[PDB]
Amino acid sequence: LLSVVGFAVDLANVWRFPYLCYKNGGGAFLIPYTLFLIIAGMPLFYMELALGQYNREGAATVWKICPFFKGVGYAVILIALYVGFYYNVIIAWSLYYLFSSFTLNLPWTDCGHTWNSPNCTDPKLYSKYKFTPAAEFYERGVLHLHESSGIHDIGLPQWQLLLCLMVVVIVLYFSLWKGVKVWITATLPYFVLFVLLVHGVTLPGASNGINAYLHIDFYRLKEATVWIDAATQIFFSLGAGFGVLIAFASYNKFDNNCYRDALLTSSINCITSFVSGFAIFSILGYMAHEHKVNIEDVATEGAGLVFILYPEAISTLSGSTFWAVVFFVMLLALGLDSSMGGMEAVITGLADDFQVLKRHRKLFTFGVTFSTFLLALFCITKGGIYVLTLLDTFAAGTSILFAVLMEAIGVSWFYGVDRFSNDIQQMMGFRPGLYWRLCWKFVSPAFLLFVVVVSIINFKPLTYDDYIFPPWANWVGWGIALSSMVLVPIYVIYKFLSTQGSLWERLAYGITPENEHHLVAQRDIRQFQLQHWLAI
């Protein structure tokens, strides 16, 4: 009713999906997206919920079921800590836009302002990009991009965005320092999306936007970037791979039916994503028709697409100020909820792992939030959109795909998928069934390993709209990705080193659950008997 409704919608759903869908064509992004959501996203969501709910442990410490894999929990915690660096900058932007949308005549409509350049063009009077009043506001008035030569020269933070990020981090801390623990913040995004869909589809030229959306081109599906984008967006929206589902479900009741939650969340995700893309392309069609430019080159396909679209739509509704205020309140509340969820994943994992941390949640919360603030200072610089692009590309990229692949492999092969299904039948009365066992053991790891190998061997040098990141920027992005990814083999080669006993003793102790470590002394384990692995 409300739980799955608010739960489903996320900032990653109304901010990242729009420009990922624009950049990857129109509906050509919804075929890979839906494919993964059906095959490798819904089973992974259900698996994460079941894991967290049965084991009662956070992202990091849920690996008492197969010790060698605690590195996977550490990797997901690191991925979350990374994403939290640039996920607070989006909320800083939302806060700045809510602050600047409190005037009658909004700023992003005309360009007789002070941040406008002598190149601006107002449609109410051939790189049409970044010359429209709203694009010049976002770039020149908020980010101050015009003061950064690139990712090599990023000036000092913008005191406006500095204050906004500071307030956001203060809100996060003060809402996250006491324990882990309304309906309007879960109903609003859907209502704003409904208003946008209706009005947009009423807009002139939105017919061309909807046609470009519905016109599926397959030469683009044949490429490797659309599938990587779809997979990363599915794991970025539904949560599988951030240690957030496990941490949140550990507090769910035991008899809680996580299968219902998985089904409803996937359904709502698919539906709302189709609708959001529909509305976004209606707004793109209107922008392209009013600005006299093609739909494929009317706006930025980067991290600031929605901050140019949604002002463009706001400014075409009656009483557009009320709409600006309400839409940016919605965006800010969604951002705060999602960032609090990610920070809670991190804190709950690292506290469930280290009791010394769980004793002091004030100090640990302060540490985590102060770290995220100091590291977002980089993204809120004058060339901070470049660092934000770097992080968005590499923070949760092949890193998240690899983490989720290793988690699925662990649970489905080393901990057994028949064992997992027996746990399910224990906490829910019904066995998951053939479809889910098959998507956990074979189909999900297959798809995810293919997408990982592709994202590695089909990686396109990082670039902003018309800016080619220098080579070392890609080097640093891959350093980030690997730092996130290299924790699994490190922790395995560690476990195998800090367990006294024969080679097979050490390969069992790290592969058996932590409670049934008295069954290993006999040299009798399931993983060793070569029948476990035939558990389809």
Select 141 or 341, whichever has its Cβ closest to ligand YNT.
Answer: 341
User: Is residue 12 near ligand YNT by the rule CB under 6 A?
Assistant: yes
Residue 338, annotated as binding a ligand: yes
Binding partner of 36, given ligand YNT, ligand NAG, none, CB within 5-8 angstroms per partner class: none
- The 81-100 contact track toward ligand YNT, x by CB under 6 A, reads --xx--x-------------
**Helix 398-409, helix 42-55: angle, nearest 10:** 60
Which parts of this chain interact with ligand NAG (CB under 6 A)?
A: 118-119
CA end-to-end span of the chain: 35
Question: With respect to ligand YNT, which residue has the nearer C-beta, 80 or 168?
Answer: 80
To the question of whether residue 110 is assigned a binding role by annotation, the answer is: no
Annotated binding residue at 288?
A: no
Q: State yes or no: 255 annotated in a binding site.
A: no
Three-state secondary structure string covering 335-400: HHHHHHHHHHHHHHHHHHHCHHHHHCHHHHHHHHHHHHHHHHCCCCCCCHHHHHHHHHHHCCCHHH
Number of C-beta neighbours around residue 511 at 10 A: 20
Check the annotation: does 353 bind a ligand: no
When CB distances are held under 5 to 8 angstroms depending on the partner's kind, the choice from ligand YNT, ligand NAG, none that residue 242 binds is ligand YNT
And the tokens for 8?
Answer: 């489903």
Site map (CB under 6 A) of ligand YNT, residues 229-268, x = contact: -------x--x--x-x------------------------
Residue 132, helix vs strand vs coil: coil
169 vs 380: CA distance, rounded Å: 13
341 binds ligand YNT (CB under 6 A): yes
Q: Which residues contact 371 (CB under 8 A, 6 or more apart)?
A: 81
Distance CA 423, CA 417 (A): 10
43 binds, among ligand NAG, ligand YNT, none (CB under 5 to 8 A by kind): none
Q: Which of 8, 10, 28, 89 binds ligand YNT (CB under 6 A)?
A: 10
Using CB atoms within 10 Å of the CB of residue 371, give its burial: 0 to 12 exposed, 13 to 18 middle, 19+ buried.
Answer: middle
SS3 522: coil
Which residue, 112 or 118, has its beta carbon nearer to ligand NAG? Answer: 118
Environment class of 317 (CB within 10 Å of its CB; exposed 0-12, middle 13-18, buried 19+): middle
Judged by CB under 6 A, the number of residues near ligand YNT is 16
Pick the binder of ligand YNT from 339, 365, 399, 484 (CB under 6 A). Answer: 339
Paired tokens of 110: 């005309």
378 binds, among ligand YNT, ligand NAG, none (CB under 5 to 8 A by kind): none
**Choosing among ligand YNT, ligand NAG, none, which partner's interface includes residue 119 (Cβ < 5 to 8 Å by kind)?**
ligand NAG
- Tell me the closest approach of the beta carbon of residue 111 to ligand NAG, in angstroms: 12
For residue 463, the SS3 value is strand
342 binds ligand YNT (CB under 6 A): yes
118 contact choice in ligand YNT, ligand NAG, none (CB below 5 to 8 Å, kind-dependent): ligand NAG
What CA–CA distance (Å, rounded) separates 196 from 218?
28
Query: Which residue is closest to ligand YNT by CB?
Result: 342
Nearest to 342 by CA among 155, 32, 76, 126: 76
According to the binding rule CB under 6 A, does residue 148 interact with ligand YNT?
Answer: no
Crossing angle of helices 417-428/42-55, nearest 10°? 70
338 binds ligand YNT (CB under 6 A): yes
Distance CA 88, CA 157 (A): 14
How many of the other CB atoms lie within 10 Å of CB of 99? 13
The item of ligand NAG, ligand YNT, none sharing an interface with residue 244, based on CB under 5 to 8 Å by kind, is: ligand YNT
Residues annotated within a binding site for Na(+) = 6, 8-9, 13, 237, 269, 337-338
Residues annotated within a binding site = 6, 8-10, 13, 22-23, 80, 84, 236-237, 269, 301, 337-338
Task: Give the residues lining the site for ligand YNT (CB under 6 A).
Answer: 10, 12, 80, 83-84, 87, 236, 239, 242, 244, 338-339, 341-343, 345
